[PDB]
Design a protein around this ligand. Structure first.
Ligand SMILES: CCCCCCCCCCCCCCCCCC(=O)OC[C@H](COP(=O)([O-])OCC(O)COP(=O)([O-])OC[C@@H](COC(=O)CCCCCCCCCCCCCCCCC)OC(=O)CCCCCCCCCCCCCCCCC)OC(=O)CCCCCCCCCCCCCCCCC
Ligand SMILES: CCCCCCCCCCCCCCCCCC(=O)OC[C@H](COP(=O)([O-])OCC(O)COP(=O)([O-])OC[C@@H](COC(=O)CCCCCCCCCCCCCCCCC)OC(=O)CCCCCCCCCCCCCCCCC)OC(=O)CCCCCCCCCCCCCCCCC
Ligand SMILES: CCCCCCCCCCCCCCCCC[C@@H](O)O[C@H](CO[C@H](O)CCCCCCCCCCCCCCC)COP(=O)(O)OCC[N+](C)(C)C
Ligand SMILES: CCCCCCCC/C=C\CCCCCCCC(=O)OC[C@H](COP(=O)(O)OCCN)OC(=O)CCCCCCC/C=C\CCCCCCCC
Ligand SMILES: CCCCCCCC/C=C\CCCCCCCC(=O)OC[C@H](COP(=O)(O)OCCN)OC(=O)CCCCCCC/C=C\CCCCCCCC
Ligand SMILES: CCCCCCCCCCCCCCCCCC(=O)OC[C@H](COP(=O)(O)OCCN)OC(=O)CCCCCCCCCCCCCCCCC
Ligand SMILES: Nc1ncnc2c1ncn2[C@@H]1O[C@H](COP(=O)(O)OP(=O)(O)O)[C@@H](O)[C@H]1O
Lengths: 98, 54, 49, 54, 321, 347, 459, 99
């Protein structure tokens, strides 16, 4: 495997580690979640373009579509949380306990 | 009656097991419900599964 | 008359009763016919009768 | 001359936030009856703007 | 359809379509022994609205089974006469009566809302759950009940009454306490003759200081004296010429009305939080007495099975029902 | 929420799950997962309050992370094989990623905290739908890809789920959290049998779904969400408490009830593969689940807790809404042990 | 076996469809009829068992246990109708239903021909017993007693399930006839040691073994009278029956693995008799006496000789009858004074003569008095233990002396002396109680008359 | 007090209403017939009939058959000078020992 695939997979790993390590803001974690799908899009299109899988060229567009559907869902939940508490801090999401 | 039946036969098998189960139950259920905490736990679990399992 | 308000189940829902009895009869006759056809087909395939 | 049945002490034993309380879990509180928490007194903090004189 | 629900809603039954702009909730309020009942009767009959007398004990008895009241041991377990005779009882009669009366008023308000949303006809209540707390404060400031009883009342009232629509019109009849006592003496009933002046004053203070200021913000409030309340023609004329668009009823939509109707037509969901596990000595009943009284209630004539399935009260065709 | 919108959201959740269970393409399976989550979030947020909003937020975050890991596994598998068909995965790294993603979606330990948190946060109908259907789908994917499952990782997560469910259910007093920990333990049992017999996995899924439906519908009938709220049901409708008691006995695995059949069959199947330590540990650990089921049974039916005074009015009034298939779910969850050999029909 | 199984499943709807005041009469009459019908199982063969069908079979070991269960049900009905006068009709019918289900499960357990069906049924017996204890117990401790009973039994029995499925996988069948005919020796290995341990430990917990017995006083003292009767008479015999059944495939590992259990049984027999000497509760005294007798039965099964098995069977039957009678007598006393303290009620011989006679006969049967079947079983076990080793005679003699001591101590404390002055509500003994005692005691004497019916297949 | 609880009821005596009570039921006729059915069925039917049935159960254990066979074998073996008890259960010719 070339080093380009290594860099894209490392980018996905970095974006995944960012999401799993919150700081204060839910918006920052939503941005980290959006980056993972960007890395997935780049990796998928690099793989498909290199193997000339012609009919697979439509897959990254569907990937983007469901990516922004998830982004919309996250934004809606974020506005509800911000209306409830005044800030998008994840510390306020502590009413429910394990 | 007292030393064996009422004290040590109760202490060994049934009481110690119940105490251990209660302690483990408290330990597991004592969570503040913080997504930051258990997502850090998720990251640790993912790293361990990737490295220690082949 | 006893109740101050007419109970919802004051009189039988004759439509539901008739549908229930018809469904039971249909299922039983269908099961009998299916069992008869199954026995006949089994005998025919295995060359018994 | 009658069978024992649970009383208010038994019910209050079973009525805490969790079984087997600790310090933190004693500081915990049971959820509201209809699962609706009282609204928080957040401040709107509208933007204050000087329209003029320049 | 054949019963209101989501299927009826998607079929097209709409409360806004059903309403006729005369569908109003009017609650008449006043101190003890006022003309509020007669005023409510006159207002209901002049405006063509359905009258709901004050929800005392045995209202649920009147609305279920046969209309006849049940035994006090099976329905309410409280006595207004005993409250009058010995207000500071050691058996919690005062707060048992107060909580039972609040539950009865909640049930009556649910029934009135269901009738309004299913028929479009307005309802005139002789009192509501929003006016019920004045007797709670009157008991509390006189030492009849305890702070724990007040707190339990507040919790139940919050979680229950937070879900309903306030009345369109609140009509308060103001009568001075000496006149109240004169009317009580003229009536001659001994138990209410034992009522003290401070208890009557606390009710009026609660009405004047809390209930009327609270109801003014929500919607229109009409106050009349004895003479004004006696002449109901002017009261009805005043009601007919009320301009108001600041209530929640204009904000209500078809989906909100659907949710409210689904709530109010379910009488067990209305009373869901009236029995919460708060173990006050006044309202808590032991296991043995609970079992015995439940057995007696099940042994009541038309109460063992569902209403359509009680053979001993003359129900036939049970085997095909 | 409009009833039409609610039924279309339920239809969309079921459409996503069915797309997952009928697709032969990894992209279409991922699409089904995404559609299921997208239509499932508002179902959680149907009854709007801060607790419901927080539960929906946590569920969305967990499922989004799992979907990202799942798509990464799909892409990595495609890189080394060029195949989109769902079969045995060709890369061990991609298989590990897919296993972790599906375990996170199911709630297997150590990915379990969101299960009690969300189940407590959401209402009873939402919890019922969540548990049942959202376990239904990822288990289908795992059954399809079972032959490449790493036995060590799968059995580790399964045993962790069993232990953690037992202990959490031991501690909890809230009925929804108790049901969530029960779900965690049952998922542990199912995934423990998964690398050997997907038929036993499906059998345990069916029995668990039946028992969970019966229990949740009984809770909705009694309108009790806490232990003390359930302690008042004996004074209004004592039949429901007895049915709940027998259902609880069944869920604990006591013979001759329906809950013993999955444990029995799974233990037999794992023994056929020369596994003894794991079946013995799994059998012994379920006694914690049985203990807290028995504790719940003591409070509701086997003893009489004190009641209140408005329960007389509650006596006077009658239940209106009729639960659909509740008697069938109660019978199927207690009295189907003699019908065990139908698992061949399930095969 | 269906001619006995179906009438119980018909006792159920008869109980639920009879009138409110006729449930006890109908249940008692038809239980007695079913017992009479089940008396026909005693006609056994000298060569093999009675193999009715592929699912059920009867033997010289199963037949007396089935007859004892079917005879025990109506006595439990009598005691229950004694103590459940104010109950509602539905709850009376539910209690009768629990008893009927327990009897049906016990019958199917004793007649099951496979080990896995036997496991399923003998674990199914827990649910009715747990319901009865934790629902109709009088005191608070019934919940803890039920928890202890259930968890002891299940923690013992789950490894038995694992071992049974493993044995089926290894050998091809769990059918008792096949495993007896196709049995092979058990080599000395860790795996075989732990298989032996799983099976034996399950049944030892059921016995109970000394050190695994606290659940027995807990449950027996806190259970209602019918629950106490069934727990001691029959439910303790499931462990002995199982051990006498499974030990076919556990040889020759039983020669070496039985030492700790034999030592525990003998020493704990001594210790539980000594505990009986110093019990302030009558029910606890009866329960610990049961523990000692079942420890002797464990010794017999572990030494595993043809003379020991006959003694084990006879002692199991005798102990069932005697312990049921003792529990009934103590329950009548409790129903008098509403307390289980032994020294509370005294002078009961001068206050109730015929009950004093019943106490005397029950106590004389509790200790090994010749020629009672209690003594027959105990003497056979002692002779087999003597052939095993010659200090077991020392231990058995100590146990017999302490047994006589505590039995006569109970008799003298409850019946002799002077009556308590302030207890003035001791009404004369009822015809129902006297009939219960007579029906407990007469079959024991008739069995003494005809002893080959309870000596098992080894006779 | 912490609850609205019933007082503990007084113990009910069956002999107060019915002096000739058998202790089965409060109702006199029901109690009498319960006594009658219990005594008749249990004592008479079960005890007497089952006891005589067990006493006259046929000799299916073949005790007397074994005794008669033993008598025949002893007679034959002592008449011909053969040992009364054979040394081996099976035939050494039919047994094949390993080398
Ligand atoms: C398309 C053609 C058909 C359309 C039918 C619906 C539209 C027409 C009726 C209508 O307007 O309904 C509105 C109505 C919503 O009105 P609402 O006033 O908002 O009521 C709110 C609550 O439903 C009110 O709460 P509730 O207590 O009424 O709860 C209702 C509902 C709430 O629960 C659910 O909706 C969950 C449904 C799935 C349950 C789990 C199934 C598990 C199957 C496992 C695999 C088996 C193989 O069901 C239950 O609580 C019990 C469900 C038992 C399912 C047993 C399945 C056994 C197989 O819609 C529904 O009740 C759901 C319809 C779902 C349709 C899709 C197919 C299922
Ligand atoms: C601690 C002191 C101690 O070892 O006391 C043993 C002693 C056993 O009596 P013993 O006469 O000294 O044993 C005879 C030989 O020394 C040992 O017998 P052996 O040398 O002829 O070989 C047979 C040996 C073969 O040895 C092995 O298999 C050793 C490998 C480990 C086996 C672990 C088995 C655990 C089974 C469940 C135990 C639950 C408790 O069998 C066993 O170890 C049997 C294990 C089960 C014993 C009874 C379980 C119920 C105990 C009730 C009281 C609990 C408190 O006491 C106990 O086992 C219970 C009390 C101490 C805890
Ligand atoms: C000196 C002191 C002596 C005092 C002795 C007092 C007893 C009087 C003498 C004995 C009675 C005369 C002898 C009767 C004897 O012969 O019958 C016995 C028989 O007794 C009965 O079999 C006992 C029945 C025991 C079973 C009763 C079941 C009733 C229901 C109980 C259910 C609970 C049982 C649970 C465990 C099964 C012995 O059998 P057997 O000598 O050969 O009979 C001879 C007839 N033959 C030749 C045709 C065989
Ligand atoms: C890796 C494998 C090991 C993992 C775990 C294996 C489990 C082994 C078997 C577990 C048996 C399950 C019973 C234990 C349940 C937990 C008991 C507990 O929590 O202790 C506290 C509890 C009191 O608290 P609660 O009743 O919950 O309510 C308090 C109200 N304020 O203590 C008790 O009194 C309960 C006791 C239960 C019965 C006693 C145990 C029975 C005997 C146990 C050993 C079995 C012997 C085997 C033969
Ligand atoms: C903490 C310490 C706990 C010590 C007690 C043990 C209970 C924990 C159970 C965990 C298992 C430990 C023993 C495992 C034994 C085992 O698995 O092997 C038995 C053998 C394995 O053979 P193979 O795998 O085929 O090997 C092939 C060789 N070529 O299989 C069997 O025989 C079935 C045995 C079932 C497992 C029995 C485990 C329990 C041992 C009996 C103890 C009974 C305890 C009863 C509890 C009552 C009192 C508490
Ligand atoms: C494949 C079909 C699955 C079920 C589809 C329908 C589910 C919703 C309807 C049932 C609701 C619960 C049952 C009780 C209803 C009580 C109210 C009432 O009066 O119902 C009347 C109804 C008969 O009405 P009727 O319209 O005549 O029915 C025949 C079809 N026209 O009376 C009844 O319907 C009562 C009898 C119902 C039958 C039992 C339930 C289905 C069992 C199918 C066999 C398989 C069992 C295992 C199921 C799970 C695995 C498949
Ligand atoms: N919450 C309450 N607590 C105690 N008593 C109440 C309560 N509500 C109503 N009552 C009693 O019910 C009666 C209501 O009638 P009242 O207000 O006098 O009008 P009228 O004179 O028309 O009957 C009064 O005697 C009052 O004391």
């Amino acid at each position: 495997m070339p080093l380009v695939y290594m860099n894209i997979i490392m980018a996905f790993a970095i974006a995944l580690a960012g999401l799993l390590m919150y700081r204060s803001h839910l918006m920052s974690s939503l941005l980290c979640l959006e980056g993972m799908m960007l890395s997935l899009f780049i990796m998928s299109t690099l793989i498909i373009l290199n193997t000339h899988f012609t009919l697979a060229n439509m897959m990254p567009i569907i990937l983007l579509v469901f990516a922004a559907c998830e982004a919309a869902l996250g934004l809606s939940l974020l506005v509800m949380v911000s209306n409830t508490y005044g800030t998008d801090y994840v510390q306020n999401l502590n009413l429910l306990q394990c | 009656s007292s030393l064996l039946d009422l004290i040590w036969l109760e202490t060994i098998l049934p009481k110690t097991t119940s105490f251990i189960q209660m302690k483990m139950s408290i330990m597991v259920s004592n969570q503040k419900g913080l997504i930051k905490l258990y997502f850090l736990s998720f990251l640790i679990t993912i790293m361990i599964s990737m490295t220690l399992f082949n | 008359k006893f109740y101050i308000r007419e109970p919802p189940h004051g009189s039988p829902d004759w439509l539901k009763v008739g549908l229930t009895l018809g469904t039971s009869v249909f299922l039983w006759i269908y099961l009998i016919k299916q069992h008869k056809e199954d026995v006949l087909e089994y005998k025919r395939r295995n060359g018994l009768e | 001359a009658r069978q024992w049945q649970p009383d208010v002490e038994w019910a209050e034993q079973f009525g805490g936030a969790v079984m087997y309380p600790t310090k933190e879990t004693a500081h915990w509180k049971p959820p509201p009856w209809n699962d609706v928490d009282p609204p928080k007194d957040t401040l709107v903090s509208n933007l204050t703007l000087n329209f003029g004189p320049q | 359809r054949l019963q209101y629900g989501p299927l009826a809603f998607v079929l097209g039954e709409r409360t806004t379509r059903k309403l006729t702009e005369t569908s109003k909730v009017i609650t008449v309020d006043g101190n003890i022994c006022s003309g509020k009942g007669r005023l409510a009767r006159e207002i209901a009959e002049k405006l063509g609205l359905r009258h709901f007398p004050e929800a005392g004990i045995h209202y649920a008895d009147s609305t279920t089974g046969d209309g006849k009241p049940l035994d006090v041991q099976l329905s309410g377990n409280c006595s207004l006469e005993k409250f009058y005779d010995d207000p500071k009882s050691n058996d919690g009669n005062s707060y048992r009566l107060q909580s039972w009366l609040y539950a009865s008023r909640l049930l009556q308000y649910a029934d009135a809302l269901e009738h309004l949303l299913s028929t479009g006809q307005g309802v005139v209540l002789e009192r509501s759950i929003y006016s019920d707390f004045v007797f709670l404060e009157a008991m509390y400031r006189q030492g009849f009940i305890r702070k724990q009883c007040v707190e339990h009342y507040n919790e139940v009232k919050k979680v229950t009454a937070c879900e309903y629509l306030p009345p369109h019109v609140v009509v308060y009849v103001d009568v001075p306490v000496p006149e109240i006592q004169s009317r009580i003496q003229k009536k001659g009933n001994p138990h209410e003759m034992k009522i003290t002046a401070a208890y009557l004053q606390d009710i009026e203070n609660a009405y004047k200081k809390t209930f009327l200021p609270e109801m003014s913000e929500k919607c229109e409030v009409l106050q009349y004296s004895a003479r004004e309340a006696e002449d109901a023609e002017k009261v009805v004329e005043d009601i007919e010429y009320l301009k108001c668009d600041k209530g929640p009823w204009p904000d209500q939509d078809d989906r909100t009305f659907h949710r409210l109707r689904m709530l109010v037509q379910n009488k067990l969901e209305v009373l869901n939080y009236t029995t919460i596990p708060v173990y006050l000595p006044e309202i808590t009943i032991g296991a043995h007495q609970s079992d015995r009284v439940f057995q007696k209630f099940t042994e009541l004539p038309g109460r063992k099975y569902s209403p359509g399935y009680n053979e001993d009260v003359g129900d036939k065709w049970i085997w095909l029902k | 929420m409009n009833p039409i919108i609610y039924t279309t959201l339920i239809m969309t959740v079921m459409s996503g799950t069915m797309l997952v269970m009928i697709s032969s393409h990894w992209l279409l399976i991922w699409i089904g997962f995404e559609m299921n989550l997208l239509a499932m979030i508002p179902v959680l947020m149907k009854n709007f309050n801060p607790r419901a909003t927080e539960a929906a937020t946590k569920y969305f975050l967990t499922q989004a992370t799992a979907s990202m890991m799942l798509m990464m596994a799909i892409i990595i598998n495609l890189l080394y094989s060029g195949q989109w068909t769902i079969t045995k995965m060709f890369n061990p790294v991609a298989m590990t990623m897919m296993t972790m993603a599906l375990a996170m979606k199911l709630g297997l330990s150590p990915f379990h905290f969101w299960v009690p948190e969300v189940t407590q946060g959401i209402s009873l109908q939402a919890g019922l739908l969540l548990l049942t259907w959202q376990k239904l789908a990822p288990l289908s994917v795992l059954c399809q890809i079972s032959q490449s499952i790493n036995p060590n990782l799968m059995l580790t997560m399964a045993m962790l789920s069993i232990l953690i469910g037992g202990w959490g259910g031991l501690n909890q007093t809230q009925l929804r959290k108790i049901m969530a920990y029960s779900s965690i333990a049952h998922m542990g049992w199912m995934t423990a049998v998964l690398p050997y017999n997907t038929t036993m996995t499906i059998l345990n899924l069916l029995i668990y779904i039946t028992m969970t439906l019966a229990m949740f519908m009984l809770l909705i009938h009694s309108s009790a969400t806490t232990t003390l709220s359930l302690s008042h049901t004996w004074n209004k409708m004592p039949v429901i408490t007895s049915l709940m008691m027998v259902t609880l006995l069944s869920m604990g695995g006591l013979p001759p009830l329906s809950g013993f059949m999955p444990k029995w069959m799974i233990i037999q199947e794992m023994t056929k593969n020369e596994s003894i330590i794991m079946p013995t540990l799994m059998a012994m650990t379920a006694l914690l689940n049985l203990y807290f089921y028995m504790r719940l049974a003591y409070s509701s039916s086997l003893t009489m807790f004190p009641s209140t005074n408005n329960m007389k009015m509650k006596w006077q009034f009658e239940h209106t809404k009729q639960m659909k298939l509740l008697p069938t779910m109660i019978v199927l969850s207690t009295l189907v042990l003699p019908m065990t050999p139908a698992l061949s029909s399930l095969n | 076996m269906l001619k006995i199984i179906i009438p119980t499943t018909m006792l159920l709807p008869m109980t639920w469809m009879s009138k409110h005041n006729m449930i006890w009469i109908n249940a008692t009459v038809h239980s007695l009829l079913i017992s009479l019908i089940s008396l026909s199982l005693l006609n056994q063969l000298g060569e093999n068992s009675l193999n009715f069908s592929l699912t059920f079979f009867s033997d010289s070991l199963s037949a007396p246990l089935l007859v004892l269960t079917t005879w025990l049900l109506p006595l439990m009905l009598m005691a229950s109708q004694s103590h459940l006068s104010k109950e509602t009709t539905t709850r009376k019918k539910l209690y009768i239903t629990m008893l009927i289900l327990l009897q049906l499960f016990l019958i199917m357990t004793f007649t099951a021909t496979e080990l896995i069906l036997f496991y399923i049924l003998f674990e199914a017996t827990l649910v009715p017993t747990l319901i009865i204890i934790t629902r109709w117990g009088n005191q608070t401790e019934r919940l803890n007693a039920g928890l202890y009973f259930l968890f002891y039994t299940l923690a013992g029995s789950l490894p038995l399930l694992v071992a049974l499925v493993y044995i089926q996988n290894t050998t091809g069948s769990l059918n008792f006839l096949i495993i007896h005919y196709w049995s092979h020796p058990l080599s000395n290995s860790w795996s075989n040691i732990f298989m032996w341990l799983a099976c034996i430990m399950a049944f030892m917990v059921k016995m109970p073994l000394y050190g695994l017995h606290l659940w027995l006083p807990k449950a027996h003292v806190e259970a209602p009278i019918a629950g106490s009767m069934v727990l001691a008479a029959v439910l303790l015999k499931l462990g002995g029956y199982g051990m006498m059944r499974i030990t076919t495939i556990l040889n020759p590992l039983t020669n070496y693995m039985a030492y700790p259990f034999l030592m525990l049984s003998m020493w704990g027999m001594i210790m539980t008799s000594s505990i009986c000497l110093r019990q302030t509760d009558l029910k606890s005294l009866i329960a610990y006496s049961s523990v000692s007798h079942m420890a002797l039965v464990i010794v017999a099964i572990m030494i595993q000789t043809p003379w020991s098995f006959m003694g084990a069977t006879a002692l199991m039957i005798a102990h069932g009858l005697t312990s049921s009678m003792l529990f009934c007598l103590a329950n009548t006393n409790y129903e008098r004074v509403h307390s289980r303290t032994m020294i509370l009620a005294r002078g009961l011989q001068t206050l109730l003569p015929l009950m004093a006679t019943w106490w005397l006969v029950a106590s004389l049967t509790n200790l090994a008095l010749p020629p009672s079947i209690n003594l027959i079983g105990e003497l056979f076990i002692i002779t087999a233990s003597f052939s095993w080793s010659n200090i077991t005679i020392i231990l058995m003699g100590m146990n017999m002396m302490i047994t006589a001591l505590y039995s006569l101590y109970m008799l003298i404390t409850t019946q002799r002396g002077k009556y308590t002055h302030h207890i003035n509500n001791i009404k004369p003994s009822f015809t129902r109680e006297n009939a219960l005692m007579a029906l407990h005691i007469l079959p024991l004497l008739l069995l003494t008359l005809n002893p080959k019916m309870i000596l098992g297949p080894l006779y | 007090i912490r609850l609205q609880e019933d007082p503990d009821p007084e113990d009910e005596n069956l002999y107060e209403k019915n002096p000739d009570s058998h202790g089965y039921d409060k109702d006199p006729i029901v109690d009498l017939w319960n006594m009658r059915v219990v005594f008749f069925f249990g004592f008479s039917i079960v005890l007497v009939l089952g006891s005589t049935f067990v006493a006259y159960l046929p000799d299916y254990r073949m005790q007397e058959w074994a005794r008669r066979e033993a008598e025949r074998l002893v007679k034959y073996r002592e008449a011909n000078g053969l040992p009364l008890m054979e040394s081996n259960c099976f035939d050494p010719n039919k047994i094949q020992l390993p080398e």
